[PDB]
Write a protein that binds this ligand. Sequence first.
Ligand code: R9Y
Ligand code: NA
Length: 330
Amino acid sequence: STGSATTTPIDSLDDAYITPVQIGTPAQTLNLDFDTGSSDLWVFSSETTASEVDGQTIYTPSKSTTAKLLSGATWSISYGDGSSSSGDVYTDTVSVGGLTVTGQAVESAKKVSSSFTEDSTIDGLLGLAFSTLNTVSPTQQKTFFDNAKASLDSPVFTADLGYHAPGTYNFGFIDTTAYTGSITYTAVSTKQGFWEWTSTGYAVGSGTFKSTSIDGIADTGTTLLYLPATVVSAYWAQVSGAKSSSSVGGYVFPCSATLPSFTFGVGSARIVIPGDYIDFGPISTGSSSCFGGIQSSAGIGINIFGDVALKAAFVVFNGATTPTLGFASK
Ligand SMILES: CN1CCCc2cc(CN)ccc21
Ligand code: NA
């Protein structure tokens, strides 16, 4: 089997991407944020505290003839930004882009943080990291990908995010029309439950490539590129008037600037992030200070190749017995 779904930016900055997901019988379509940095499929629901819902579409298990309460099971997650959600669990039929999983754990939110309530466009998250990070207790649950894997033509999914444009998530096949050149594969460590890999270095604009190992995770659920402070300082030093602002919470730059590209290594290959991808616009409405899309990881404890980096590539998440990542230009 295979599946193929379009993923759409939620706003003009590509802060996040939503993908339609069919849950239950008859289908209830919710727009979920596919998140390669977490392992819970959780949704706004008929159980969510009413004051914490503001425009999201909700899953109503009582309207699904295939929904079963997973008796005794609860979940609670805290994301790296400080956001959170928690609740109880149903199993139901879940379909993405024509690929169907029966008996998928659908984590129903009783509580969400204000940061989720405020995002009316996001109806929940579909985690695609390893199932060892799933938060359901007392019986840990599998991701949609882990449940689908055995049925897929090939045990893979691919992320093809757009810059200010829709893109695609494919499950079970590699669309050889969607990238240029060849795919360069690189080793993955699953020891922390992430798609963790090592980049071979970086360049700033037209500058020389610096060979240096940078461990990090491929995380579609994170907007920006978080890298070590040495690398980030080298990038922003090439932008007149850029500075790190403790008041704003990262590097800012004059909105009049033209940003240089950023290149990262994948083995002997190179992925080039155009400068425009690194512009996240005014810090507040009307400001002439703009927020940068490359930020320090120093306060995080991990480097994160989030959407700023991933949208510059066609990315293969290879879930074979020995997982690997693949990157291609596009
Ligand atoms: C609060 N916020 C809404 C936008 C999508 C989203 C995704 C994650 C997962 N990294 C965490 C928070 C969050
Ligand atoms: Na921000």
